[PDB]
Amino acid sequence: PTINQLVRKGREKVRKKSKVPALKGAPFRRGVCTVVRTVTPKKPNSALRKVAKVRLTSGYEVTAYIPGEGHNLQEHSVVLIRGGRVKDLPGVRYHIVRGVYDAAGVKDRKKSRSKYGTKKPKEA
Amino acid sequence: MLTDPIADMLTRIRNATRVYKESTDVPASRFKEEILRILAREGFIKGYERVDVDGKPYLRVYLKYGPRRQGPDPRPEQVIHHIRRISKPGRRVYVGVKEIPRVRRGLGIAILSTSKGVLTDREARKLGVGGELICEVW
RNA sequence: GGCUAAUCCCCCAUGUGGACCCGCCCCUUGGGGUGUGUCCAAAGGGCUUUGCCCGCUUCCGGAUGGGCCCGCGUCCCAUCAGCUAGUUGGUGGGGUAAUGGCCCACCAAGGCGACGACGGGUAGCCGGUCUGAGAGGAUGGCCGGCCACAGGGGCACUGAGACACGGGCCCCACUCCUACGGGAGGCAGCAGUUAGGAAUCUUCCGCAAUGGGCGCAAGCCUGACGGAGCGACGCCGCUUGGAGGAAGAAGCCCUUCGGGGUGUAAACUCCUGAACCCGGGACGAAACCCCCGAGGAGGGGACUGACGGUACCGGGGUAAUAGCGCCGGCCAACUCCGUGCCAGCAGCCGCGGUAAUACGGAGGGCGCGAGCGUUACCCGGAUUCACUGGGCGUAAAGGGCGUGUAGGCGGCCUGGGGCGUCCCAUGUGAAAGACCACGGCUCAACCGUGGGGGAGCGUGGGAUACGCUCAGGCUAGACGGUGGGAGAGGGUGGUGGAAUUCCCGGAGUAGCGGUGAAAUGCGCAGAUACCGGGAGGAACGCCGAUGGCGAAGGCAGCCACCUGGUCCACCCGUGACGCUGAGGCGCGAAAGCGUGGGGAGCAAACCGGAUUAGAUACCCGGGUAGUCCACGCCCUAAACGAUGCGCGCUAGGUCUCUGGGUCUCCUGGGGGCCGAAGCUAACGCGUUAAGCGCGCCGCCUGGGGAGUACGGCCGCAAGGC
RNA sequence: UUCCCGGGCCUUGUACACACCGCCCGUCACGCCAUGGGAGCGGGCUCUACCCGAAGUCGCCGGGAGCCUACGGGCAGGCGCCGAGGGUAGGGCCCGUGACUGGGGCGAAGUCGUAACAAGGUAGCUGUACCGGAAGGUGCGGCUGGAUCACUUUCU
Ligand SMILES: [K+]
Ligand SMILES: [K+]
Ligand SMILES: [K+]
Ligand SMILES: [K+]
Ligand SMILES: [K+]
Ligand SMILES: [K+]
Ligand SMILES: [K+]
Ligand SMILES: [K+]
Ligand SMILES: [K+]
Ligand SMILES: [K+]
Ligand SMILES: [K+]
Ligand SMILES: [K+]
Ligand SMILES: [K+]
Ligand SMILES: [K+]
Ligand SMILES: [K+]
Ligand SMILES: [Mg+2]
Ligand SMILES: [Mg+2]
Ligand SMILES: [Mg+2]
Ligand SMILES: [Mg+2]
Ligand SMILES: [Mg+2]
Ligand SMILES: [Mg+2]
Ligand SMILES: [Mg+2]
Ligand SMILES: [Mg+2]
Ligand SMILES: [Mg+2]
Ligand SMILES: [Mg+2]
Ligand SMILES: [Mg+2]
Ligand SMILES: [Mg+2]
Ligand SMILES: [Mg+2]
Ligand SMILES: [Mg+2]
Ligand SMILES: [Mg+2]
Ligand SMILES: [Mg+2]
Ligand SMILES: [Mg+2]
Ligand SMILES: [Mg+2]
Ligand SMILES: [Mg+2]
Ligand SMILES: [Mg+2]
Ligand SMILES: [Mg+2]
Ligand SMILES: [Mg+2]
Ligand SMILES: [Mg+2]
Ligand SMILES: [Mg+2]
Ligand SMILES: [Mg+2]
Ligand SMILES: [Mg+2]
Ligand SMILES: [Mg+2]
Ligand SMILES: [Mg+2]
Ligand SMILES: [Mg+2]
Ligand SMILES: [Mg+2]
Ligand SMILES: [Mg+2]
Ligand SMILES: [Mg+2]
Ligand SMILES: [Mg+2]
Ligand SMILES: [Mg+2]
Ligand SMILES: [Mg+2]
Ligand SMILES: [Mg+2]
Ligand SMILES: [Mg+2]
Ligand SMILES: [Mg+2]
Ligand SMILES: [Mg+2]
Ligand SMILES: [Mg+2]
Ligand SMILES: [Mg+2]
Ligand SMILES: [Mg+2]
Ligand SMILES: [Mg+2]
Ligand SMILES: [Mg+2]
Ligand SMILES: [Mg+2]
Ligand SMILES: [Mg+2]
Ligand SMILES: [Mg+2]
Ligand SMILES: [Mg+2]
Ligand SMILES: [Mg+2]
Ligand SMILES: [Mg+2]
Ligand SMILES: [Mg+2]
Ligand SMILES: [Mg+2]
Ligand SMILES: [Mg+2]
Ligand SMILES: [Mg+2]
Ligand SMILES: [Mg+2]
Ligand SMILES: [Mg+2]
Ligand SMILES: [Mg+2]
Ligand SMILES: [Mg+2]
Ligand SMILES: [Mg+2]
Ligand SMILES: [Mg+2]
Ligand SMILES: [Mg+2]
Ligand SMILES: [Mg+2]
Ligand SMILES: [Mg+2]
Ligand SMILES: [Mg+2]
Ligand SMILES: [Mg+2]
Ligand SMILES: [Mg+2]
Ligand SMILES: [Mg+2]
Ligand SMILES: [Mg+2]
Ligand SMILES: [Mg+2]
Ligand SMILES: [Mg+2]
Ligand SMILES: [Mg+2]
Ligand SMILES: [Mg+2]
Ligand SMILES: [Mg+2]
Ligand SMILES: [Mg+2]
Ligand SMILES: [Mg+2]
Ligand SMILES: [Mg+2]
Ligand SMILES: [Mg+2]
Ligand SMILES: [Mg+2]
Ligand SMILES: [Mg+2]
Ligand SMILES: [Mg+2]
Ligand SMILES: [Mg+2]
Ligand SMILES: [Mg+2]
Ligand SMILES: [Mg+2]
Ligand SMILES: [Mg+2]
Ligand SMILES: [Mg+2]
Ligand SMILES: [Mg+2]
Ligand SMILES: [Mg+2]
Ligand SMILES: [Mg+2]
Ligand SMILES: [Mg+2]
Ligand SMILES: [Mg+2]
Ligand SMILES: [Mg+2]
Ligand SMILES: [Mg+2]
Ligand SMILES: [Mg+2]
Ligand SMILES: [Mg+2]
Ligand SMILES: [Mg+2]
């Protein structure tokens, strides 16, 4: 474009939309579960994966994945959630942190405990 | 009409150099003549002269080239590789003494215009004067 | 209701002076000087008391701090376009330290606005911080500067100073007391509590230091501050040992069963000695004060330490926390077993359905370390909003075309000015921070000192090449004169031939029509075919094309009239009068709409016949709107050369339209083709550029959703932007 | 050597590359989300007109209805302008809910068909008009992004 055009209209600054509506620049969000379900994946894969309907203190209600080999989640269970999405499972914009509140960490995982929220096992 | 007589000249030079022409004709002016004086002093051209075509004044600029080369495409290396106008109509480029650029690590020159007249980059640097930056040539 | 003191209030005098009206002088907005008239001062107290100290009154000036005015800069939405009513300005008043429409009367109708007003959304701004090569982008916590607020709203007093966080008044909500009439309360001060929340501290020590208020002083107050505590929240510093140690213990893991791996790693040997135990114990602290001197200068003496028995010094002195992510590719580090599209991993490409280096475990390995990953957010890579630093022939993107307002841009020469631009000097650019050098805590972090800088603007001076402006001039751009030329350029009116269809007439017979093949249909009221005559509409065969005209749409028999655009020649005239062009305006194929007319052929819909599994279609027979004309609307498109306009430069060859010429050929303009250089991702473009450059307009930033939803504008409607 | 099957060479078109037993369109039906219109009913803001209007400055009265007085006046008190706020009516905007209802996306793949890519079987695209279970069909006109020298006939 001509210089004068840039003098008049000028360049446009691109915006960015949040993929995590926990609002408040939220690192995490606390919420109470609604249901506990099993969702069928899209075309690329086949499996039974554990998700949950969660109402949030922010006022939002969204689905959240449940990592780990096994878990315990009831209807009214209290759960802290974090950002990040799940690609093979459309509609899930959030992850559930384990080891927090009513969500217990996975049992007997000795490789990576940190992300799955397990304490260091007893010594030899 | 001609929007930028300077740019017209320089572009004609670029063209003529691309086709390895002998000389080229440019409309006569004091500015242009001075710029060509700077061009001749640093040896980017064989030289110039005042000529008359039809009933109108012109300037014959004799180009400059290198020796014949080897392999395919016998065309000799351009003495002037790249030349481009900087200041333009609608955007004027003005630089102070400390704003004066340095072309190709000194391997090339910059043509400016000050109140002391048309100068090179090193000339304007030594005289310590800023002005309009007309174009870059290397 | 009553007594009473004073630096409380008042009255009179004193007029160094100042204040006000009027006059004069100078200066120039209300600055200063001066004259008469008028008006104005006041506080005492303590002494080491008859001399000093503190304080008071008036005026001038300085210093400090601040008010008001102005130039410039200051986010997002144009689906917010008109906004303003004391609003804009003036006269006269009120108010204030002072201008102001701050406030009030009267008069006028002005003021703001695509250079983004008003409206909506959002946000304390800055010194700086983070990132980045740079430009820039984002951010405004801590420290510092300014602003605003003090439960929500509003108002004044006091006073130098407030529209006043721990002052006052009222209204509103809430809490508390109430004898129910009424009052009390305002932690966005320190700490602490509650609630919210992913989440942020001790209801601590101290007036020693610094600073602040009062006081002659002693001194008092000070959650300002100086300190400590809690929190790996961040940065920095340090320890968990150092050395000697077998081809190499065990255990474990691979294994070609030979061996290899963990690995000098450990045991062990020796040495050092974080932690802890004692001893000594700091800088920060010398002033205010007292003495001499003079209550000055100078000299001398004395008191005072929250941190804190802490920093540190000296002596003794134990081998004494390691964890976390990852190991398919990006990306550095591999094997065994388990699992079998299950369980699950994931940032992207993806892994897993029997032997997975991707899941789970194990061995081993890599990265980092008192930390390591995850999520969220910012810059980056990203030249992906491109000033540096991009694009629009086919990937996203040329506006349908023209006219032309604002705006942007400016041919050659001479001169003035010196707004832009450039230079010197000066003022500002606070401190901290950032950069450099030295130094203080054993170093670093941190701190100190000093040095170095800096864009931007103000002021004074200087330069005049370019830009600008004024003065004058030139003629290559452009316009015009004269003389020629072509063309389906456009409007009005008239007119001609061929053919289709219908009517009339003659002649004439058994079918014509139509398909892949048939049938519907027409025909004994006599068709098809032939001839003659008439009617009427619509389109113009050969010429005619690879052609021409127009700005685009588009334009085709011929005559006349009205009229636009354009090419060439003669160098004749004017003298830069130019290019572009947001908005506006006009034009704008076909379809469609309104009114009226006209209607041969054609033909959506539709009435039918075939074909087919079905045929709401392709084939066939009919047939309305429409097609046409008049006027008024509708603004769309593959409105395409998928290439905005104007100018300059850059090999040619070939075909053609048209104009001129010394007419084999040269030249000017237009339309095609092959192609130098060059450009292009390729195809391809290539003097008709998409090449080399310039000026200006429009437009693009992944696909789908969707040219949809909603809003606004235009239209009768359909719809369009 | 026209046609049926297999095959070869050259060329042309392609939206095919597990390669025409290919790809691919849409109505309807099933699964899952978000969204528009929207009567009606709540809530909020703003604007105009009228009306009520506390505190407080300012303004007037301040008198044989009050108090102090050096008689000059002052205070109290009263009235009034403005005014926070409140009410009425009207207008507009935002926000919540909302019966009914429009279309959309993704997915699991069912249904009627063959639309589009080879002349995709009537070349396609297109703006517009009308009609049709649907893709679509046809009329007017336009474009080359159209092949080629000149009955019909689905799907995987
Ligand atoms: K006097
Ligand atoms: K004092
Ligand atoms: K002294
Ligand atoms: K040890
Ligand atoms: K496998
Ligand atoms: K593995
Ligand atoms: K693994
Ligand atoms: K990013
Ligand atoms: K277009
Ligand atoms: K033509
Ligand atoms: K090439
Ligand atoms: K329309
Ligand atoms: K052969
Ligand atoms: K193609
Ligand atoms: K009285
Ligand atoms: Mg799978
Ligand atoms: Mg993420
Ligand atoms: Mg009394
Ligand atoms: Mg006197
Ligand atoms: Mg006097
Ligand atoms: Mg007196
Ligand atoms: Mg006002
Ligand atoms: Mg006045
Ligand atoms: Mg005044
Ligand atoms: Mg805010
Ligand atoms: Mg703020
Ligand atoms: Mg960058
Ligand atoms: Mg940097
Ligand atoms: Mg804070
Ligand atoms: Mg509060
Ligand atoms: Mg005071
Ligand atoms: Mg204040
Ligand atoms: Mg106060
Ligand atoms: Mg308080
Ligand atoms: Mg909580
Ligand atoms: Mg103190
Ligand atoms: Mg002090
Ligand atoms: Mg071993
Ligand atoms: Mg060792
Ligand atoms: Mg020792
Ligand atoms: Mg020892
Ligand atoms: Mg003495
Ligand atoms: Mg002394
Ligand atoms: Mg590797
Ligand atoms: Mg399993
Ligand atoms: Mg993992
Ligand atoms: Mg396996
Ligand atoms: Mg991985
Ligand atoms: Mg960038
Ligand atoms: Mg650019
Ligand atoms: Mg690009
Ligand atoms: Mg395109
Ligand atoms: Mg165009
Ligand atoms: Mg124009
Ligand atoms: Mg103009
Ligand atoms: Mg010029
Ligand atoms: Mg100009
Ligand atoms: Mg100047
Ligand atoms: Mg300076
Ligand atoms: Mg500084
Ligand atoms: Mg040092
Ligand atoms: Mg410094
Ligand atoms: Mg100056
Ligand atoms: Mg001069
Ligand atoms: Mg002139
Ligand atoms: Mg003529
Ligand atoms: Mg004509
Ligand atoms: Mg008829
Ligand atoms: Mg007869
Ligand atoms: Mg019959
Ligand atoms: Mg008969
Ligand atoms: Mg007949
Ligand atoms: Mg033309
Ligand atoms: Mg055309
Ligand atoms: Mg002449
Ligand atoms: Mg003349
Ligand atoms: Mg039209
Ligand atoms: Mg029409
Ligand atoms: Mg009509
Ligand atoms: Mg009609
Ligand atoms: Mg039938
Ligand atoms: Mg038909
Ligand atoms: Mg017919
Ligand atoms: Mg020619
Ligand atoms: Mg030509
Ligand atoms: Mg040619
Ligand atoms: Mg070519
Ligand atoms: Mg080439
Ligand atoms: Mg190629
Ligand atoms: Mg667009
Ligand atoms: Mg998108
Ligand atoms: Mg999008
Ligand atoms: Mg539309
Ligand atoms: Mg064959
Ligand atoms: Mg052969
Ligand atoms: Mg081939
Ligand atoms: Mg087939
Ligand atoms: Mg009233
Ligand atoms: Mg009142
Ligand atoms: Mg009163
Ligand atoms: Mg709703
Ligand atoms: Mg079709
Ligand atoms: Mg079709
Ligand atoms: Mg087909
Ligand atoms: Mg057909
Ligand atoms: Mg077809
Ligand atoms: Mg087609
Ligand atoms: Mg159509
Ligand atoms: Mg039909
Ligand atoms: Mg057609």
mmCIF file with all atom_site columns, N, CA and C (backbone and C1' of nucleotides) in Angstrom, chain A residues 41-47 49 87-90, chain C residues 341 344-346 350-353, chain D residues 107-108:
data_model
loop_
_atom_site.group_PDB
_atom_site.id
_atom_site.type_symbol
_atom_site.label_atom_id
_atom_site.label_alt_id
_atom_site.label_comp_id
_atom_site.label_asym_id
_atom_site.label_entity_id
_atom_site.label_seq_id
_atom_site.pdbx_PDB_ins_code
_atom_site.Cartn_x
_atom_site.Cartn_y
_atom_site.Cartn_z
_atom_site.occupancy
_atom_site.B_iso_or_equiv
_atom_site.pdbx_formal_charge
_atom_site.auth_seq_id
_atom_site.auth_comp_id
_atom_site.auth_asym_id
_atom_site.auth_atom_id
_atom_site.pdbx_PDB_model_num
ATOM 1   N N     . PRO A 1 41  ? -14.253 -41.615 21.062 1.00 0.00 ? 41  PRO A N     1
ATOM 2   C CA    . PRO A 1 41  ? -13.348 -40.772 20.275 1.00 0.00 ? 41  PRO A CA    1
ATOM 3   C C     . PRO A 1 41  ? -13.757 -40.679 18.807 1.00 0.00 ? 41  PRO A C     1
ATOM 4   N N     . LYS A 1 42  ? -13.194 -39.710 18.091 1.00 0.00 ? 42  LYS A N     1
ATOM 5   C CA    . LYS A 1 42  ? -13.502 -39.519 16.678 1.00 0.00 ? 42  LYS A CA    1
ATOM 6   C C     . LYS A 1 42  ? -12.794 -40.553 15.802 1.00 0.00 ? 42  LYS A C     1
ATOM 7   N N     . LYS A 1 43  ? -12.876 -40.354 14.489 1.00 0.00 ? 43  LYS A N     1
ATOM 8   C CA    . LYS A 1 43  ? -12.385 -41.312 13.492 1.00 0.00 ? 43  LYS A CA    1
ATOM 9   C C     . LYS A 1 43  ? -10.972 -41.893 13.707 1.00 0.00 ? 43  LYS A C     1
ATOM 10  N N     . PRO A 1 44  ? -9.955  -41.044 13.980 1.00 0.00 ? 44  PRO A N     1
ATOM 11  C CA    . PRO A 1 44  ? -8.589  -41.589 14.026 1.00 0.00 ? 44  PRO A CA    1
ATOM 12  C C     . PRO A 1 44  ? -8.362  -42.722 15.030 1.00 0.00 ? 44  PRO A C     1
ATOM 13  N N     . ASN A 1 45  ? -9.126  -42.759 16.117 1.00 0.00 ? 45  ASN A N     1
ATOM 14  C CA    . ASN A 1 45  ? -8.910  -43.787 17.129 1.00 0.00 ? 45  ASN A CA    1
ATOM 15  C C     . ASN A 1 45  ? -10.188 -44.452 17.623 1.00 0.00 ? 45  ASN A C     1
ATOM 16  N N     . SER A 1 46  ? -10.016 -45.452 18.481 1.00 0.00 ? 46  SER A N     1
ATOM 17  C CA    . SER A 1 46  ? -11.126 -46.130 19.139 1.00 0.00 ? 46  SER A CA    1
ATOM 18  C C     . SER A 1 46  ? -10.736 -46.495 20.567 1.00 0.00 ? 46  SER A C     1
ATOM 19  N N     . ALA A 1 47  ? -11.589 -46.142 21.526 1.00 0.00 ? 47  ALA A N     1
ATOM 20  C CA    . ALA A 1 47  ? -11.302 -46.369 22.941 1.00 0.00 ? 47  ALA A CA    1
ATOM 21  C C     . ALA A 1 47  ? -12.462 -45.946 23.829 1.00 0.00 ? 47  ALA A C     1
ATOM 22  N N     . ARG A 1 49  ? -12.834 -43.521 26.977 1.00 0.00 ? 49  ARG A N     1
ATOM 23  C CA    . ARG A 1 49  ? -12.110 -42.531 27.765 1.00 0.00 ? 49  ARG A CA    1
ATOM 24  C C     . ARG A 1 49  ? -13.005 -41.820 28.769 1.00 0.00 ? 49  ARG A C     1
ATOM 25  N N     . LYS A 1 87  ? -7.308  -33.494 21.907 1.00 0.00 ? 87  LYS A N     1
ATOM 26  C CA    . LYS A 1 87  ? -7.598  -33.418 20.477 1.00 0.00 ? 87  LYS A CA    1
ATOM 27  C C     . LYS A 1 87  ? -8.514  -34.534 19.975 1.00 0.00 ? 87  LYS A C     1
ATOM 28  N N     . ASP A 1 88  ? -8.262  -35.762 20.417 1.00 0.00 ? 88  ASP A N     1
ATOM 29  C CA    . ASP A 1 88  ? -9.010  -36.928 19.913 1.00 0.00 ? 88  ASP A CA    1
ATOM 30  C C     . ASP A 1 88  ? -10.415 -36.911 20.539 1.00 0.00 ? 88  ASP A C     1
ATOM 31  N N     . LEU A 1 89  ? -10.618 -36.078 21.557 1.00 0.00 ? 89  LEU A N     1
ATOM 32  C CA    . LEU A 1 89  ? -11.915 -35.954 22.213 1.00 0.00 ? 89  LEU A CA    1
ATOM 33  C C     . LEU A 1 89  ? -12.449 -34.529 22.106 1.00 0.00 ? 89  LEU A C     1
ATOM 34  N N     . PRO A 1 90  ? -13.188 -34.241 21.023 1.00 0.00 ? 90  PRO A N     1
ATOM 35  C CA    . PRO A 1 90  ? -13.766 -32.916 20.769 1.00 0.00 ? 90  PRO A CA    1
ATOM 36  C C     . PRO A 1 90  ? -14.712 -32.472 21.879 1.00 0.00 ? 90  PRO A C     1
ATOM 37  P P     . C   C 2 341 ? -7.533  -55.426 21.085 1.00 0.00 ? 341 C   C P     1
ATOM 38  O "O5'" . C   C 2 341 ? -8.084  -53.930 21.080 1.00 0.00 ? 341 C   C "O5'" 1
ATOM 39  C "C5'" . C   C 2 341 ? -7.314  -52.869 20.521 1.00 0.00 ? 341 C   C "C5'" 1
ATOM 40  C "C4'" . C   C 2 341 ? -8.086  -51.572 20.503 1.00 0.00 ? 341 C   C "C4'" 1
ATOM 41  C "C3'" . C   C 2 341 ? -9.367  -51.591 19.670 1.00 0.00 ? 341 C   C "C3'" 1
ATOM 42  O "O3'" . C   C 2 341 ? -10.333 -50.733 20.274 1.00 0.00 ? 341 C   C "O3'" 1
ATOM 43  C "C1'" . C   C 2 341 ? -7.909  -49.940 18.828 1.00 0.00 ? 341 C   C "C1'" 1
ATOM 44  P P     . G   C 2 344 ? -8.153  -46.275 31.531 1.00 0.00 ? 344 G   C P     1
ATOM 45  O "O5'" . G   C 2 344 ? -6.741  -45.544 31.442 1.00 0.00 ? 344 G   C "O5'" 1
ATOM 46  C "C5'" . G   C 2 344 ? -6.463  -44.607 30.413 1.00 0.00 ? 344 G   C "C5'" 1
ATOM 47  C "C4'" . G   C 2 344 ? -5.034  -44.724 29.948 1.00 0.00 ? 344 G   C "C4'" 1
ATOM 48  C "C3'" . G   C 2 344 ? -4.427  -43.482 29.317 1.00 0.00 ? 344 G   C "C3'" 1
ATOM 49  O "O3'" . G   C 2 344 ? -3.996  -42.526 30.270 1.00 0.00 ? 344 G   C "O3'" 1
ATOM 50  C "C1'" . G   C 2 344 ? -3.932  -45.358 27.980 1.00 0.00 ? 344 G   C "C1'" 1
ATOM 51  P P     . C   C 2 345 ? -3.965  -40.964 29.889 1.00 0.00 ? 345 C   C P     1
ATOM 52  O "O5'" . C   C 2 345 ? -2.683  -40.819 28.955 1.00 0.00 ? 345 C   C "O5'" 1
ATOM 53  C "C5'" . C   C 2 345 ? -1.395  -41.188 29.426 1.00 0.00 ? 345 C   C "C5'" 1
ATOM 54  C "C4'" . C   C 2 345 ? -0.335  -40.998 28.371 1.00 0.00 ? 345 C   C "C4'" 1
ATOM 55  C "C3'" . C   C 2 345 ? -0.222  -39.603 27.776 1.00 0.00 ? 345 C   C "C3'" 1
ATOM 56  O "O3'" . C   C 2 345 ? 0.521   -38.720 28.598 1.00 0.00 ? 345 C   C "O3'" 1
ATOM 57  C "C1'" . C   C 2 345 ? -0.156  -41.228 26.046 1.00 0.00 ? 345 C   C "C1'" 1
ATOM 58  P P     . A   C 2 346 ? 0.109   -37.173 28.714 1.00 0.00 ? 346 A   C P     1
ATOM 59  O "O5'" . A   C 2 346 ? 0.235   -36.627 27.224 1.00 0.00 ? 346 A   C "O5'" 1
ATOM 60  C "C5'" . A   C 2 346 ? 1.507   -36.364 26.647 1.00 0.00 ? 346 A   C "C5'" 1
ATOM 61  C "C4'" . A   C 2 346 ? 1.368   -35.808 25.254 1.00 0.00 ? 346 A   C "C4'" 1
ATOM 62  C "C3'" . A   C 2 346 ? 0.356   -34.681 25.099 1.00 0.00 ? 346 A   C "C3'" 1
ATOM 63  O "O3'" . A   C 2 346 ? 0.886   -33.415 25.450 1.00 0.00 ? 346 A   C "O3'" 1
ATOM 64  C "C1'" . A   C 2 346 ? -0.037  -36.309 23.443 1.00 0.00 ? 346 A   C "C1'" 1
ATOM 65  P P     . G   C 2 350 ? -0.407  -37.206 10.763 1.00 0.00 ? 350 G   C P     1
ATOM 66  O "O5'" . G   C 2 350 ? 0.291   -37.941 11.989 1.00 0.00 ? 350 G   C "O5'" 1
ATOM 67  C "C5'" . G   C 2 350 ? 0.120   -39.327 12.240 1.00 0.00 ? 350 G   C "C5'" 1
ATOM 68  C "C4'" . G   C 2 350 ? 0.951   -39.740 13.427 1.00 0.00 ? 350 G   C "C4'" 1
ATOM 69  C "C3'" . G   C 2 350 ? 0.607   -41.075 14.070 1.00 0.00 ? 350 G   C "C3'" 1
ATOM 70  O "O3'" . G   C 2 350 ? 1.209   -42.170 13.404 1.00 0.00 ? 350 G   C "O3'" 1
ATOM 71  C "C1'" . G   C 2 350 ? 0.777   -39.421 15.745 1.00 0.00 ? 350 G   C "C1'" 1
ATOM 72  P P     . C   C 2 351 ? 0.582   -43.641 13.546 1.00 0.00 ? 351 C   C P     1
ATOM 73  O "O5'" . C   C 2 351 ? 0.953   -44.073 15.034 1.00 0.00 ? 351 C   C "O5'" 1
ATOM 74  C "C5'" . C   C 2 351 ? 2.311   -44.174 15.436 1.00 0.00 ? 351 C   C "C5'" 1
ATOM 75  C "C4'" . C   C 2 351 ? 2.443   -44.658 16.858 1.00 0.00 ? 351 C   C "C4'" 1
ATOM 76  C "C3'" . C   C 2 351 ? 1.686   -45.924 17.210 1.00 0.00 ? 351 C   C "C3'" 1
ATOM 77  O "O3'" . C   C 2 351 ? 2.335   -47.100 16.763 1.00 0.00 ? 351 C   C "O3'" 1
ATOM 78  C "C1'" . C   C 2 351 ? 1.379   -44.319 18.917 1.00 0.00 ? 351 C   C "C1'" 1
ATOM 79  P P     . G   C 2 352 ? 1.485   -48.275 16.072 1.00 0.00 ? 352 G   C P     1
ATOM 80  O "O5'" . G   C 2 352 ? 0.680   -48.927 17.283 1.00 0.00 ? 352 G   C "O5'" 1
ATOM 81  C "C5'" . G   C 2 352 ? 1.370   -49.485 18.392 1.00 0.00 ? 352 G   C "C5'" 1
ATOM 82  C "C4'" . G   C 2 352 ? 0.427   -49.902 19.493 1.00 0.00 ? 352 G   C "C4'" 1
ATOM 83  C "C3'" . G   C 2 352 ? -0.755  -50.763 19.082 1.00 0.00 ? 352 G   C "C3'" 1
ATOM 84  O "O3'" . G   C 2 352 ? -0.409  -52.123 18.895 1.00 0.00 ? 352 G   C "O3'" 1
ATOM 85  C "C1'" . G   C 2 352 ? -1.486  -49.062 20.553 1.00 0.00 ? 352 G   C "C1'" 1
ATOM 86  P P     . G   C 2 353 ? -0.965  -52.926 17.620 1.00 0.00 ? 353 G   C P     1
ATOM 87  O "O5'" . G   C 2 353 ? -2.537  -53.008 17.870 1.00 0.00 ? 353 G   C "O5'" 1
ATOM 88  C "C5'" . G   C 2 353 ? -3.069  -53.771 18.942 1.00 0.00 ? 353 G   C "C5'" 1
ATOM 89  C "C4'" . G   C 2 353 ? -4.278  -54.554 18.498 1.00 0.00 ? 353 G   C "C4'" 1
ATOM 90  C "C3'" . G   C 2 353 ? -4.013  -55.640 17.465 1.00 0.00 ? 353 G   C "C3'" 1
ATOM 91  O "O3'" . G   C 2 353 ? -3.565  -56.852 18.046 1.00 0.00 ? 353 G   C "O3'" 1
ATOM 92  C "C1'" . G   C 2 353 ? -5.832  -54.309 16.755 1.00 0.00 ? 353 G   C "C1'" 1
ATOM 93  P P     . G   D 3 107 ? -16.899 -34.958 11.521 1.00 0.00 ? 107 G   D P     1
ATOM 94  O "O5'" . G   D 3 107 ? -17.494 -36.180 12.351 1.00 0.00 ? 107 G   D "O5'" 1
ATOM 95  C "C5'" . G   D 3 107 ? -16.983 -36.506 13.635 1.00 0.00 ? 107 G   D "C5'" 1
ATOM 96  C "C4'" . G   D 3 107 ? -17.954 -37.358 14.412 1.00 0.00 ? 107 G   D "C4'" 1
ATOM 97  C "C3'" . G   D 3 107 ? -18.477 -38.586 13.687 1.00 0.00 ? 107 G   D "C3'" 1
ATOM 98  O "O3'" . G   D 3 107 ? -17.576 -39.678 13.730 1.00 0.00 ? 107 G   D "O3'" 1
ATOM 99  C "C1'" . G   D 3 107 ? -20.287 -37.425 14.653 1.00 0.00 ? 107 G   D "C1'" 1
ATOM 100 P P     . A   D 3 108 ? -17.321 -40.564 12.415 1.00 0.00 ? 108 A   D P     1
ATOM 101 O "O5'" . A   D 3 108 ? -17.520 -42.060 12.919 1.00 0.00 ? 108 A   D "O5'" 1
ATOM 102 C "C5'" . A   D 3 108 ? -18.418 -42.352 13.985 1.00 0.00 ? 108 A   D "C5'" 1
ATOM 103 C "C4'" . A   D 3 108 ? -19.402 -43.432 13.610 1.00 0.00 ? 108 A   D "C4'" 1
ATOM 104 C "C3'" . A   D 3 108 ? -20.271 -43.124 12.393 1.00 0.00 ? 108 A   D "C3'" 1
ATOM 105 O "O3'" . A   D 3 108 ? -20.571 -44.340 11.710 1.00 0.00 ? 108 A   D "O3'" 1
ATOM 106 C "C1'" . A   D 3 108 ? -21.649 -43.413 14.291 1.00 0.00 ? 108 A   D "C1'" 1
#
